[PDB]
Ligand binder design. Structure first.
Ligand SMILES: Cc1ccc(C(=O)O)cc1
Ligand SMILES: Cc1ccccc1C(=O)O
Length: 516
């Protein structure tokens, strides 16, 4: 793969790539479609609109939007202008967004109508610098000063050329959270999505022009950003977007060609979603679908899920691991070589190392901490020098994972080096869940660990010590948390206990809880 030139604007790159196919559909969702020509026009008018309201090169804007055709216009338009979109999870709290507003110093916000109420609460509570709120598909009357996304785009002439950025200049941020503390601003460059798109999208997956891509993973996830934006635009594939929460029925409706007159040929999703589909009574038959490739990431794929998918559809599920910091997948199975129970082999372009307790080598078959050296690494966590030093260790990026290397050069997952869980393919801190449980007046103490369900997928399990003089029932605890956590964070079970195992200093021995 040829490096990108030093003067490189990643949006311009994707637009230039598709000037050969102006009339092919770039993106389609339940209510709208953009051809590559229409996407280019609107991308460039958005870029003009953000500049017209005073947002300067290198400043940030918050992009808080459901998956839909306005999403890539917002993302690429900011980048075309040399403005830095900060693309975020749509299922966070007002408090989380308030922090992101302040931390990013965002100058504008591009927000879906459905997300406007959470955003409003964030704006009201924070010391933010937001000059304009631009609302895609408003679901309530616009407040004074706010503007509808379609009017904002349509009122500006397209910018005539892109910001003259360099390849290593910041292009966008994603946020990632660790087991405690605030979300970290992961800073990516213009070059980074070129590398992932070339090395993984093109060279590992062999995506091509006549593909139809559909990612259950939303665009704000590193995984989905590649799967449903940077990958397909690099090869001129058409992309299906869906605003709603992925469920088996929503995914199947799309697989069968229920939206936009297109049937997906490439699907991406978490192992949990694949398990859920295979358990669904109305799982489609092979002859009803056009799938040729199935990708998974977010948590390790249990072999049985992969094998049952293969038996039903005649397609393997290609499990790979990436990270927000590496932007996309660096260790993967291949479409024509899958080894279930492993995450496959290093992606060409990426070097992997397993390090032991002192940074030393590990013999094959022994677990080590996983480090990556490759060209799509983020440069830092914005404003966090200490976290940046721990993760970005001189040309090596630490992942948080442990792996074993096998005799065939494949790698098998061996757990995390922190206390994070991956649940339904999404990070969740057990300490967050603990912090929510102990605010219930009937709870004295709580400890949360990951446990494998019947499919071998990790879910939270909570051990709870009731407060002696209070009432507390499992169904009241369920109702308490329904209210306060995202559904993927729900403990799969809660066990009421009289005490927890502890060190003589009061530290909970979580390892004993995992050992039964
Ligand atoms: C049915 C289904 C498929 C995939 C996902 C996911 O979160 O990726 C969730 C649900
Ligand atoms: C977290 C992540 C980001 C990009 C690509 C894949 C993954 C993964 O979850 O393994």
């Amino acid at each position: 793969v040829t490096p990108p030139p030093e003067k490189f604007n990643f949006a311009e790159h994707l637009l230039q790539t598709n000037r050969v196919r102006p009339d092919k559909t770039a993106f389609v969702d339940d209510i709208s479609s953009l051809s590559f020509a229409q996407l280019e026009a609107q991308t460039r008018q958005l870029a003009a609109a953000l500049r017209a309201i005073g947002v300067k090169r290198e400043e940030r804007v918050l992009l808080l939007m459901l998956d839909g055709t306005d999403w890539p216009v917002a993302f690429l338009g900011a980048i075309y202008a040399g403005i830095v979109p900060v693309a975020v999870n749509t299922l966070l709290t007002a408090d989380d967004y308030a922090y992101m507003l302040e931390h990013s110093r965002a100058q504008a916000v591009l927000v879906s109508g459905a997300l406007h109420p959470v955003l409003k609460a964030a704006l009201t509570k924070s010391d933010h610098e937001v000059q304009r709120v631009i609302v895609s598909r408003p679901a309530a009357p616009l407040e004074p000063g706010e503007v509808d996304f379609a009017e904002f785009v349509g009122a500006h002439a397209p910018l005539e050329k892109p910001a003259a950025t360099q390849a290593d200049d910041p292009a966008f941020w994603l946020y990632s959270s660790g087991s405690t503390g605030r979300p970290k601003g992961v800073v990516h460059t213009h070059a980074n999505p070129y590398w992932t798109s070339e090395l993984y999208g093109r060279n590992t997956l062999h995506l091509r022009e006549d593909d139809v891509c559909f990612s259950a993973a939303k665009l704000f996830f590193a995984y989905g950003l590649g799967n449903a934006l940077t990958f397909p635009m690099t090869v001129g594939a058409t992309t299906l977007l869906m605003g709603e929460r992925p469920t088996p029925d929503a995914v199947f409706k799309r697989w069968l060609g229920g939206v936009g007159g297109v049937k997906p040929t490439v699907f991406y999703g978490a192992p949990t979603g694949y398990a859920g589909m295979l358990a669904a009574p109305n799982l489609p038959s092979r002859d009803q679908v056009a799938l040729r490739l199935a990708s998974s990431a977010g948590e390790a794929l249990p072999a049985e899920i992969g094998q049952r998918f293969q038996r039903h559809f005649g397609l393997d599920i290609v499990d790979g691991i990436g990270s927000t910091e590496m932007l996309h997948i660096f260790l993967s199975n291949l479409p024509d070589r899958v080894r279930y129970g492993t995450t496959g082999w290093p992606v060409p372009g990426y070097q992997i190392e397993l390090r032991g307790d002192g940074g030393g080598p590990v013999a094959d078959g022994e677990p080590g901490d996983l480090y990556i050296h490759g060209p799509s690494s983020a440069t830092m966590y914005w404003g966090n020098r200490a976290k940046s030093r721990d993760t970005f260790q001189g040309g090596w990026t630490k992942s948080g994972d442990k792996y074993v290397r096998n005799d065939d050069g494949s790698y098998t997952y061996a757990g995390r080096t922190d206390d994070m869980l991956k649940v339904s393919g999404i990070y969740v801190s057990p300490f967050e869940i603990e912090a929510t449980l102990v605010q219930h007046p009937g709870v004295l103490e709580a400890a949360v660990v990951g446990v494998a369900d019947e499919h071998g997928l990790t879910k939270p399990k909570a051990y709870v010590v009731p407060r002696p003089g209070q009432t507390l029932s499992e169904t009241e605890l369920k109702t308490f948390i329904k209210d306060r956590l995202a559904p993927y964070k729900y403990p799969r079970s809660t066990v009421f206990v009289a005490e927890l195992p502890k060190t003589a200093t009061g530290k909970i021995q979580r390892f004993k809880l995992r050992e039964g």
